[PDB]
């Protein structure tokens, strides 16, 4: 098994919770390049690169909180 | 008056594939219904088409299991205004299935 | 070795034949191997009226 | 079910609201175009057009602001 | 929850500060994308929706600043 | 009881108590004249409800979208 | 009143700064919402609502930089 | 052999894989209506060859800016 620590645990529960997004967004990118002046293509973007740019800055928020929890403890190790 | 109507259509595509290979087909065509002349009227048309979308599996039993994505029908027309073509190309609805089957 | 730990097995699908790989030890092996032929039915069809 | 965020409800819920106005505005066109010099084609068409139109500006509107106040309460996380 | 922090009690203020504003907007929204061209409903809408943003910045602010009123404090006790 | 209202409600809510009912008005006055569009006093009354109605929706929303402003800058800082 | 820090006398300066704009901004508000219409109405409220939106701006930042000074004066204390 | 290119490159290029031959046609279209300027049947058509030219280029920047963001709010977390 490759090792995994706790940080990319918890990085990986927001991979596996956005079950599919991460490949809706492609698709939804080829059609829209398919043919950019279709309003119906183009109402169908948007809601999807908004939902992927909030999972993205909500995973890396989070990480580097719990870093500076163990940070503080190991701290005083000495 | 009295009327009677009696119509029949069957059609049939063919695919090649592989074994857990997924595969399409795709078909579109346009038949004009001869209603003729100069001082005619415009001349009609219908148009159908189909989709397939597959995906098949042999089981040892000597059984094929397969993923399928049906779609077929024919192109809503309001424009087909006219009266004089009651000879109309027969109407056939639009249908959607998904489903496996072995 | 007998005592091998169950944390061990890896598991990874090849639907290009359909197959799996799995990697432990010849007991964990067989275990898995009773396992997937516990698991796997052939379902039957339903139709709706 | 299939993978669907909050942005992507508050979107459906203007698709499932407006029942049918998508292929109505099409048909209308397509027997316009046939006669353009028909008032009474022009009349209907004019109102669903219009309809169609400002049902597209609130749609993406309400999208956005929901993104901005996600996105204001993701910054606090730090 | 059973166990509630002093944070929690104070997000949990406002929450229970507007009576039921979180419902006002849910159901405000099912009756304009009905009928998206209605000015009174658009009208409505405007309201509750802004509202409703106001809320839900200034409760995130407020619990930033009591959790680094008291983080500066902890790190005094060594 | 009564339902909750904010600041921006009652902002936007004095102005649909100030116009006492024109919001009916402009529908009596279309039902109206649909009947016989083409009675001059008709046209003439319907002229007058229309734009006020217009001036009045405008005035009201862009009332409410000034306050909106001016408080998101102080909540602003409290960080 | 009972107890105000620098703070607030920096902030209650201004509250007296301005005599009575704060209640002439609320009389031209109804005054204009009976009769939307009149120019005159909206010419004399567009000016005092300018008015008191700057008013509020300018008095926050104050609030604000005298804050930082403040905290910036205390770290120093350890 | 080819230039190294990025993620935003080949977002940038989705966008002119998708329009094979605008680029062509929007010349071409001008330099016929330019010969005759004054033939509906061209002016029609270059209003619609001018509006998708127009759209195409608007989209493909503010995409290209999205994922700019997304990606130095990330790097900013390193730290």
């Given at each position: 098994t490759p090792w995994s620590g706790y940080l990319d645990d918890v990085s990986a529960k927001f991979d596996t919770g956005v079950d599919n997004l991460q490949t809706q967004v492609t698709e939804?990118?080829?059609?829209?390049?398919?043919?950019?002046?279709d309003p119906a293509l183009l109402a169908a973007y948007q809601s999807?690169?908004?939902?992927?740019?909030?999972?993205?800055?909500?995973?890396?928020?989070?990480?580097?909180?719990?870093?500076?929890?163990?940070?503080?403890?190991?701290?005083?190790?000495? | 008056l009295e009327e009677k109507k009696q119509?029949?259509?069957?059609?049939?595509?063919?695919?090649?594939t592989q074994e857990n290979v997924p595969a399409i087909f795709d078909n579109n065509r346009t038949f004009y219904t001869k209603l003729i002349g100069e001082r005619?009227?415009?001349?009609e048309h219908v148009t159908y088409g189909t989709m397939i979308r597959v995906l098949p599996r042999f089981s040892?039993?000597?059984?094929?299991?397969?993923?399928?994505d049906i779609e077929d029908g024919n192109d809503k027309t309001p424009q087909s205004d006219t009266t004089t073509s009651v000879d109309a190309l027969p109407e056939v609805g639009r249908t959607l299935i998904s489903t496996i089957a072995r | 070795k007998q005592n091998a730990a169950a944390g061990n097995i890896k598991i990874?699908?090849?639907?290009?034949?359909?197959s799996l790989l799995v990697k432990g030890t010849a007991e964990?092996?067989?275990?898995?191997?009773?396992?997937?032929?516990?698991?796997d039915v052939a379902k039957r069809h339903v139709e709706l009226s």
């Open positions: 939804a990118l080829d059609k829209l390049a398919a043919k950019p002046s999807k690169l908004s939902e992927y740019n909030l999972y993205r800055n909500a995973q890396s928020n989070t990480v580097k909180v719990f870093k500076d929890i163990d940070a503080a403890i190991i701290q005083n190790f000495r | 119509a029949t259509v069957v059609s049939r595509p063919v695919l090649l005619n009227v415009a001349l040892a039993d000597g059984q094929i299991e397969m993923s399928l | 990874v699908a090849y639907p290009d034949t359909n964990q092996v067989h275990f898995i191997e009773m396992l997937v032929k516990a698991l």
